[PDB]
Amino acid sequence: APQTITELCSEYRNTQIYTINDKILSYTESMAGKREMVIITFKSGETFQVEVPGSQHIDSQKKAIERMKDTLRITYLTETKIDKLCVWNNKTPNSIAAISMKN
Amino acid sequence: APQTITELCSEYRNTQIYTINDKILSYTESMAGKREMVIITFKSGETFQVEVPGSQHIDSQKKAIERMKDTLRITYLTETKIDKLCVWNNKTPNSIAAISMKN
Amino acid sequence: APQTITELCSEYRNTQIYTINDKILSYTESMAGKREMVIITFKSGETFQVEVPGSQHIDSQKKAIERMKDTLRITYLTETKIDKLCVWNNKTPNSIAAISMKN
Amino acid sequence: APQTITELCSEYRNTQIYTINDKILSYTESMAGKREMVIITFKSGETFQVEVPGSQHIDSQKKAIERMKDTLRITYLTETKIDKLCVWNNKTPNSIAAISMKN
Amino acid sequence: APQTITELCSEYRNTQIYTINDKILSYTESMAGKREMVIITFKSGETFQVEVPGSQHIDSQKKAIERMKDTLRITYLTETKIDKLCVWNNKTPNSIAAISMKN
Ligand SMILES: OC[C@H]1O[C@@H](S[C@@H]2O[C@H](CO)[C@H](O)[C@H](O)[C@H]2O)[C@H](O)[C@@H](O)[C@H]1O
Ligand SMILES: OC[C@H]1O[C@@H](S[C@@H]2O[C@H](CO)[C@H](O)[C@H](O)[C@H]2O)[C@H](O)[C@@H](O)[C@H]1O
Ligand SMILES: OC[C@H]1O[C@@H](S[C@@H]2O[C@H](CO)[C@H](O)[C@H](O)[C@H]2O)[C@H](O)[C@@H](O)[C@H]1O
Ligand SMILES: OC[C@H]1O[C@@H](S[C@@H]2O[C@H](CO)[C@H](O)[C@H](O)[C@H]2O)[C@H](O)[C@@H](O)[C@H]1O
Ligand SMILES: OC[C@H]1O[C@@H](S[C@@H]2O[C@H](CO)[C@H](O)[C@H](O)[C@H]2O)[C@H](O)[C@@H](O)[C@H]1O
Is A103 buried (19+), middle (13-18) or exposed (0-12) by CB count in 10 A?
A: exposed
DSSP letter for D103, please: -
CA distance C29 to C72: 10
What is the structure's resolution, reported in angstroms to one decimal? 1.7
CA distance E26 to E75: 11
Residue C68's closest CA among C43, C40, C31? C40
CA distance D60 to C62: 11
Q: Are B80 and B101 in contact (CB under 8 A)?
A: yes
Is D54 buried (19+), middle (13-18) or exposed (0-12) by CB count in 10 A?
A: exposed
Radius of gyration of chain D (CA): 13
What are the backbone dihedrals phi and psi of residue C77, each rounded to the nearest 5 degrees, phi first?
-55, -35
Residue D45's closest CA among D18, D63, D73, D14? D18
Partnered with residue B39 across adjacent β-strands are: B28, B49
Q: With a 6 A CB cut-off, is B33 part of the ligand 3 pocket?
A: yes
Q: With a 6 A CB cut-off, is E89 part of the ligand 5 pocket?
A: no
Question: What is the experimental method?
Answer: X-ray
Q: With a 6 A CB cut-off, is E56 part of the ligand 5 pocket?
A: yes
Which atom of ligand 5 lies at the shortest distance from residue E12's CA? 1
The one-letter amino acid at E8: L
CA distance E50 to E52: 7
A42 touches chain B (CB under 8 A): no
Residue B29's closest CA among E18, C2, E78, C30? C2
Record: contact D67-C39, CB cut-off 8 A: no
Residue nearest (by alpha carbon) to ligand 4 atom 20: D56
Which domains does chain E show, CATH number per domain?
1-103 (2.40.50.110)
DSSP letter for E23, please: -
Q: Are E64 and E75 in contact (CB under 8 A)?
A: no
The interaxial angle of helices E61-77 and D59-77, nearest 10 deg, is 20
CA distance B79 to C61: 28
Q: Are E73 and E26 in contact (CB under 8 A)?
A: no
The interaxial angle of helices E61-77 and A59-77, nearest 10 deg, is 20
**Using alpha carbons only, what angle is made at residue D64 by residues D58 and D68, rounded to the nearest 5 degrees?**
135
Contacts of E11 in chain D (CB under 8 A): 32, 35
Which atom of ligand 4 lies at the shortest distance from residue D57's CA? 11
CA distance A20 to A42: 8
Q: Are A102 and E42 in contact (CB under 8 A)?
A: no
CA distance A79 to D100: 32
Tell me whether strands A94-102 and B37-41 are parallel, antiparallel or unpaired. unpaired
